[PDB]
Structure 1
């Protein structure tokens, strides 16, 4: 056959980043990179630097980057799927871990490599098949990723006593297993929930990752698969600061093993201020599809959106405190839509708000980035291919953010990052602090 052996590459890359951080930290290390205010400290840590998350940086002129490789260079560069046009999430985890762009057989590797590592302990399987259909997917996804922790290699090698400098090699092995069992768990949370408890199927070492998943979800549409490949590539990662990424991080720094850290991250992503906004827009988009009715003019939604901005509401999906042009991940799923559902009524709706909304905002003071998110485009693209079941959308973001959160988990463990322990305070403390002192 063929390849190049991921672990063995990462094995090489490690000492070189490990040093780079040793000198940096030697020399300028004490160079003050900012201040904290009594107000930030009530402000949920409002624009504090405190992380070092080495897999993605928000570029204000250019969206998000998976190195400096942004959005638009990824779609080019990342291997596409042996007869497709949209990237493999495989080759994206590979980029996130390596810093390098996969080769076809570096990706063909992972796919083989995920299919085998893809197995499920009879007790998560049982645990799923009895869960109540009143329990949310995301309470199931996280209940069962903890219960998968039964199987961690790290838990065990820890228990036996591996040493500091070896931690990555098994935290690696736990991550590669998790990202393989993930499709199974969610494919089954779907199937039990929404496709009347049927069988997820089997799993095919022939196919790539996203495919197997879509195939277990029970979807025969190769257009949907390639949306699945695209969706999973683009919601992977987003700086370290955000709830699901900071929790997998925080918790993972107590030397908790990847099953447990990831499950704790979904408990953050099931949180309304975090998971639920892909929905929020679809729902808005839904009332609007009624209130302003089917095939509107450029004049009537201008009337609606205007009568919306000014009568003391907001347009779900639009605006960004930093990013200066349109989010590339809107643009990616738009480019998709243009190709594959161009004359869709509801995509027609979204694509109209794109024409109209920015100017309406910009002209009406709510501005500086009046441009759309990702979250604005996606749900419309899900509902088209018949994924109506919108509570379940939060799991699909979960299975995606997995690649980005676990691929930095190996790195915090490789560069051997400390237990995360900011100082708390208390108001009475503070009152004596800033002013009285």
Structure 2
């Protein structure tokens, strides 16, 4: 397998994810990955109007989401949505592949929030908003009110930071499916299922369950030192590839702080900083992208169980772009198994078992 999409701090087709998150809206980054370049003002203006037109859900899909139980795993909602949308607006040929990628990016916010608000608040919601960005549109659908400019900014920053990350289990699942020449909806449905597993997804959710235990930074440091001596895994720390830092941590940390200031938080961000300082002093371990993402989402009023669903809204851009590469250059390992079972044996009839 070859890729021109990203490499390890972290670049997207040569561009530092830090520069992108500072100076770009998510749509500029989705365009870069799916279409090959940062878009000029004409292309960006056309792109934005195309996506603003792809936000509403078909009536049949609304009626399906209404039958998924309130207590369902939200990732099964995202899986089921992608699967049903594939039967209503099919990818008849690979010529439609960029149009379908765009449709998923524009619709996923409505699939999540139409289900959530129907089952939790008993409202059937309008799936269009007045926000021109996906990041704003999401917050408009989730809370049914105009978001603050700060909260629209932090949503755009998060979608950019998580958009693409080389190869991992979900991106690999998308490529294996792609390699049989299956449709784009299959490759996304499979990638969502792999992300559902707790060894791959749920990290920012687990970071949130850790920081929410502690009523002060004193109590947090005191309890962390006990966990570290007990050799407990600490969620949000360490990486398989980076060694000095995760470029994405740099960025989200500073936005989480501005949100703490905005909402007059006294506990949650202070607790996060105490854990971050302690991990460096005791283990020289830097925090990864998931750690400060949890406080930031919480400060914008997002239910913990929607964190990994928001990652799907972002990483759909990387996944689809990987499928386009696999279709154009269909190279991948073909797996064999080591047989460890029994030797060949005679058939035994029912009466002798």
Q: TM-score, structure 2 length as denominator?
A: 0.87
2:319 to 392, 405, 410: 405
2: CA distance, partners of 1:197 / 1:173: 33
Per-residue deviation, 1:106: 2.5
Partner of 2:280: 358
Offset of residue 271 of structure 1: 1.0
Residue equivalent to 2:301: 386
Residue 212 to residue 328, structure 1, CA distance change in 2 (3 Å): same
- Which aligned segments of 4 or more residues in structure 1 are displaced greater than 6 angstroms? none
Cα distance change on mapping 1:100 and 1:304 into 2, 3 Å: same
Listed as ranges, the matches of 1:147-296 within 5 Å are 147-154=84-91, 156-157=92-93, 167=94, 169-194=95-120, 196-204=121-129, 207-218=132-143, 219-222=145-148, 223-240=150-167, 242-287=168-213, 289=214, 293-296=215-218
Superposed displacement of residue 204, structure 1: 4.5
How far off is 1:147 after superposition? Answer: 0.9
User: How big is each residue's C-alpha offset from its partner over 1:18-59, in whole Å with a ceiling of 9 and x where there is no partner?
Assistant: xxxxxxxxxxxxxxxxxxxxxxxxxxxxxxxxx32331112x
Would the aligned equivalents of 2:220 and 2:271 in 1 still touch at CA under 8 Å? no
Partner of 2:15: 69
> What are the residue-to-residue correspondences of 1:273-422 with 2, within 5 Å?
273-287=199-213, 289=214, 293-296=215-218, 302-342=221-261, 344=265, 345-362=267-284, 370-387=285-302, 389-413=303-327, 415-417=328-330, 420=332, 422=334
Question: Are the equivalent residues in 2 in contact too, given 1:153–1:170 (CA < 8 A)?
Answer: no
Q: Out of 264-273 and 341-350, give the one that drifted further.
A: 341-350
Q: Counterpart in 2 of 1:425?
A: 337
Secondary structure of the structure 2 residue equivalent to 1:326: coil
Do structure 1's residue 122 and structure 2's residue 59 form an aligned pair? yes
Stretches of structure 2 that go unaligned for 5 or more consecutive residues are: 342-353
Task: Give the whole-Å Cα distance in 2 for the aligned partners of 1:272 and 1:227.
Answer: 25
Give the CA deviation at 1:266.
0.6
* Distance in 2 between residues matched to 1:421 and 1:295, nearest whole Å: 48
Residues in 1 aligned to 2:153 and 2:191: alpha-carbon distance in whole angstroms: 26
| Pairing 1:131–2:105 present | no
Provide TM-score, normalisation by structure 1. 0.71
Cα pair 2:26 2:159 within 8 Å, conserved: yes
Root-mean-square deviation (CA, aligned residues, Å) is 2.2
Give the corresponding residue for 2:77. Answer: 140
Using the TM superposition, give the Cα deviation of residue 348 of structure 1 relative to its aligned residue in structure 2, in angstroms: 1.2
Q: Work out the CA distance in 2 between the residues paired with 1:339 and 1:146.
A: 38
